[PDB]
Amino acid sequence: LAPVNIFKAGADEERAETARLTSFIGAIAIGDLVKSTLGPKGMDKILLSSGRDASLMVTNDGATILKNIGVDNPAAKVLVDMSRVQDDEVGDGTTSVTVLAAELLREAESLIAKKIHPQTIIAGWREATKAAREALLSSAVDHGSDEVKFRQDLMNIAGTTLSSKLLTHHKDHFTKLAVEAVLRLKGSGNLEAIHIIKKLGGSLADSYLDEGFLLDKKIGVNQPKRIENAKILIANTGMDTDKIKIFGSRVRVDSTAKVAEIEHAEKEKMKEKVERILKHGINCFINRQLIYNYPEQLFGAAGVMAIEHADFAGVERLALVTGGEIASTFDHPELVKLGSCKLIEEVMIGEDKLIHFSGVALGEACTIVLRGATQQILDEAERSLHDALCVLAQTVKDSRTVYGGGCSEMLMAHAVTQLANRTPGKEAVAMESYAKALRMLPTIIADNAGYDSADLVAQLRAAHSEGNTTAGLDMREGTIGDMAILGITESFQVKRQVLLSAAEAAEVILRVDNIIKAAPR
Amino acid sequence: LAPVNIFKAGADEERAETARLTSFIGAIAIGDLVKSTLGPKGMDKILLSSGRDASLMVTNDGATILKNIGVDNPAAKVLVDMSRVQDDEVGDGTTSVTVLAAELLREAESLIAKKIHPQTIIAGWREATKAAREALLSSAVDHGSDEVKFRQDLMNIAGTTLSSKLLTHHKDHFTKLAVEAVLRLKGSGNLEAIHIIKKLGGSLADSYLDEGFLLDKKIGVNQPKRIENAKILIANTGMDTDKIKIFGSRVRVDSTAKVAEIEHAEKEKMKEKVERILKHGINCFINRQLIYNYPEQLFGAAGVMAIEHADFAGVERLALVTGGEIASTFDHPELVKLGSCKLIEEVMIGEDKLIHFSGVALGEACTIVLRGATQQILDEAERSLHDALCVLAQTVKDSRTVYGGGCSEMLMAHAVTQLANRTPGKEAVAMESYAKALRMLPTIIADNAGYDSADLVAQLRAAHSEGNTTAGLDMREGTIGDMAILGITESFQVKRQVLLSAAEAAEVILRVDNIIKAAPR
Amino acid sequence: KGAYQDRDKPAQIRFSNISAAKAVADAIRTSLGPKGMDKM
Numbered sequence A, B: 001l002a003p004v005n006i007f008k009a010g011a012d013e014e015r016a017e018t019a020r021l022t023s024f025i026g027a028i029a030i031g032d033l034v035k036s037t038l039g040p041k042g043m044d045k046i047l048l049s050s051g052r053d054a055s056l057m058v059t060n061d062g063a064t065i066l067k068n069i070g071v072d073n074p075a076a077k078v079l080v081d082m083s084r085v086q087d088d089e090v091g092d093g094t095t096s097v098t099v100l101a102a103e104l105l106r107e108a109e110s111l112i113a114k115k116i117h118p119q120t121i122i123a124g125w126r127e128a129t130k131a132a133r134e135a136l137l138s139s140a141v142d143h144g145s146d147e148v149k150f151r152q153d154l155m156n157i158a159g160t161t162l163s164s165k166l167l168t169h170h171k172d173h174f175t176k177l178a179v180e181a182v183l184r185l186k187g188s189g190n191l192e193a194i195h196i197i198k199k200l201g202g203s204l205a206d207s208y209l210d211e212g213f214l215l216d217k218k219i220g221v222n223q224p225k226r227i228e229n230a231k232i233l234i235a236n237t238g239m240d241t242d243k244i245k246i247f248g249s250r251v252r253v254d255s256t257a258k259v260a261e262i263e264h265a266e267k268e269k270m271k272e273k274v275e276r277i278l279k280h281g282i283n284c285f286i287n288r289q290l291i292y293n294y295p296e297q298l299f300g301a302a303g304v305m306a307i308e309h310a311d312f313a314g315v316e317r318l319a320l321v322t323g324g325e326i327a328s329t330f331d332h333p334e335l336v337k338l339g340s341c342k343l344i345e346e347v348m349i350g351e352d353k354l355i356h357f358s359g360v361a362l363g364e365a366c367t368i369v370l371r372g373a374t375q376q377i378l379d380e381a382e383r384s385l386h387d388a389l390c391v392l393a394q395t396v397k398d399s400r401t402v403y404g405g406g407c408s409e410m411l412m413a414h415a416v417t418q419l420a421n422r423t424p425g426k427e428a429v430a431m432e433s434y435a436k437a438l439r440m441l442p443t444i445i446a447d448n449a450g451y452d453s454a455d456l457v458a459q460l461r462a463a464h465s466e467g468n469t470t471a472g473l474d475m476r477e478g479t480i481g482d483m484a485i486l487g488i489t490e491s492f493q494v495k496r497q498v499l500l501s502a503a504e505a506a507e508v509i510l511r512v513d514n515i516i517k518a519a520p521r
Numbered sequence C: 001k002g003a004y005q006d007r008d009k010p011a012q013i014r015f016s017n018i019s020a021a022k023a024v025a026d027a028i029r030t031s032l033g034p035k036g037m038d039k040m
């Protein structure tokens, strides 16, 4: 360091050795913290806090843990941001991509320690990623016309996604529930229509899927409970003190009789508006705002169900389930239309009363009632269900599946090895390191399972080199079996995005030098 | 851990993973710090202090650095103790053995990370060390019948030892000086008899070797400086008030004349003792104690040079060079065996006066004058000369030389690989790690030289596997040359001790999985 | 096509030593020559 001071007091700067060492240490720590929850037989962690309101959550996803930990290393922050971007993209593979990035950085550490230029390593990694993305497209199964095989593929994908979390005990029912809930969207990618209601009472065996719709709201006073063959009409107006006029109207009279006449005129206008609302020939009114005492009794005197407290999400869900539109003004009853329902009642789930809506016509949206004993278990089940729904929507929009379990990684490693075995130079070390980092994932999976990892990896590599380019790893016993016989199937776009994000993160962190830190506030 | 505390306040307890990780980190740090000074083209180190009046020194060997730093890690303390033991034994192989131990520990870290039992690794390492020592014992050159070949081997060993330090510029003279100084011992283990006097000022070319002896003492007053022919006699008596006894005698008289007579009798006794000392017919008296004024003037009045203030080392050197015998009492002149010398004078080297001794009969010991600029350069030169003399005495007592440079390590690695390629089980991983460490040991020197280390290592491995067990590494150009033609030859005992110490340190550190620290005072 | 360097501490140490030596030589440059002054 130069004796002349340049930076301000309280600002350190790492050159090349210390900066790279700290980055590699942080990357290894990040990769090892989440490495325990990667294989199918992984466990769960505890993420307790003290600065908030003593929040305690137990989950198995890696992105959630990385976001709740709150790291301070610059490379760890980039890894957390990449994991968050991946979770917001497809949300299915964060631990895998972060483990691949950690392994790539660990290999780059030893490569730099062997006096190798970083540009050659970057070029070799780019060539390996290109070869992997070229060989992965050729090993994809296209489907869409055959619905019988498509349903089986979707069921297998949902089962494989659910067997990697806490739903392994009830995968036999949750997979079918998710499959039935996905088909109700009619190809629509709107994930906000699926409402998840978690309750504290029963276990996971008491969970089911309602064929209609449920609402956790209350009805008015002196109103009929069960109404058979009704017509739901969603509205959007302000019944509670109708003063939408933004004018500067002020009562400047000089007698109480004029004020009484103005109040009577306002009441008559409210009554006329209520009558115009019921002029459509309906019997189940639903508003988005609050209902006072006059409109409540006005609707109850005619036998019309009134529902209060409804946000935009509930209104959209009701419109997607029934078929009506968000009407207002109430002047042309012909251009408003209604819904369709023949069964409306109130059920009691545990200790609360909810309105049950059955006998729908369309049914684009649906609700899922979750039951659990602990809040952490309920949160884990909700997260697993959301991830399963997301991966199902992704594999439906992709219309192509890829055999998972570890066959794609082995094929990519074999392609990288075949590409490296034909070109000389110093680029063969980067491709070998990439192949080792790709093959280390089945090794870590087998180590977390509890079987011999090296022997199984060697057998799988020998099979893939001799011809068996479709086998994987049996988790029920610890042997080598075909992936097309068991029922393990992943996706293509998810794996492609994972590989691209891992390659981008590796290329970004590989060219990192001079970590200049400013003065902390 | 358990909520009930057992230890006191301030006592930590590392388990199996934390202690092993700390030991591995410490070993990696020690190896990275010591790998800078390994090859012949290494650099120097600055070891400054802050409590010992800022002691500044320049060293090249790792033993001095490890002894001067003094860390607190027990894994590094074990290596420091091993290096100190090796330096006290032979003193030529500390950086090599500590680098081998660091590489073995780094390999054992990855082996344990691969879920491997430590007992199998220990057994494999023991088998590899046994095979390496067997190959080293089988491949050995015994030279003792021929004189010219033995002298050439000694000169080559001295040159290879001196080229690793700062003596590569004057190796054409320091090697010959060390060879001439070693042959003066007549095949004895009296390494402490060779005095090394360092004087400030002058270049390295003025460091000449005196064939006689030099003493930095002063003779008596009124005595002849130069003597044509004299007979040196070494005595062991006290000329300064000869009355040192345990006798509690006292003078209890009643007159000053009695005290005067007692003093006169004591003076007469001292004069008689001085006359009996010169009764042997000598003229160059040398005493190891102090000489007052009366014996000095008595020796000067008779024309006899008297030298006082002599240590035990100087007395032993004078007795071994001049062939004299340490005598006392001075009562049997027929049995004393006086010395013999035909040249006594005083020279002026720099700004001090030293007695020059030449023309001796035997001359087993010899003095070495070192001339340099600063004190650090002189200290480094003295340390290198001492190490060269030690390794020369070792290879003379062993009477067997083995080609070094990088052939022995490659042969040991090939033997370990051939042994591992015959036995199954998990023991082949430890032998593979041992072979990798033996192949990486010369890779550090190849990288420090400034050439392609991987290509040279591959070429050396191919040459050793094709049937050429005499190839090595060339430092003058960076290629592959013959070790029996250039002159790169080391020792067998040093290499065997280094290998055994490395194996013992590896077996000791690998068998540790618990650290219980006490409360610091 | 090779000879990559991954160490920077010895270079900085050598640069600091050279700078210190140059500063010392510039400080002792005054007391030099027959037309030089004395220091206190």
Ligand SMILES: Nc1ncnc2c1ncn2[C@@H]1O[C@H](COP(=O)(O)OP(=O)(O)O)[C@@H](O)[C@H]1O
Residues within 6 Å of the ligand: A037, A038, A039, A040, A061, A062, A092, A093, A094, A095, A096, A097, A160, A161, A163, A164, A404, A405, A406, A445, A473, A475, A488
């Ligand atoms: N039933 C199964 N059979 C075989 N492999 C499985 C099974 N379940 C999960 N895996 C493997 O475990 C890996 C991790 O899956 P998952 O936990 O769903 O993703 P992430 O680890 O990103 O959370 C996948 O690559 C997959 O190949």
Ligand SMILES: Nc1ncnc2c1ncn2[C@@H]1O[C@H](COP(=O)(O)OP(=O)(O)O)[C@@H](O)[C@H]1O
Residues within 6 Å of the ligand: B037, B038, B039, B040, B061, B092, B093, B094, B095, B096, B097, B160, B161, B163, B164, B165, B404, B405, B406, B473, B475, B488
């Ligand atoms: N002229 C040379 N040519 C090749 N190698 C050499 C030469 N001189 C020394 N060496 C190497 O240097 C090593 C010893 O270096 P040094 O640091 O002096 O002792 P240590 O064995 O304690 O490290 C030996 O293993 C030897 O292979």
Ligand SMILES: [Mg+2]
Residues within 6 Å of the ligand: A092, A093, A164
């Ligand atoms: Mg997953």
Ligand SMILES: [Mg+2]
Residues within 6 Å of the ligand: B091, B092, B093, B094, B164
């Ligand atoms: Mg040495």
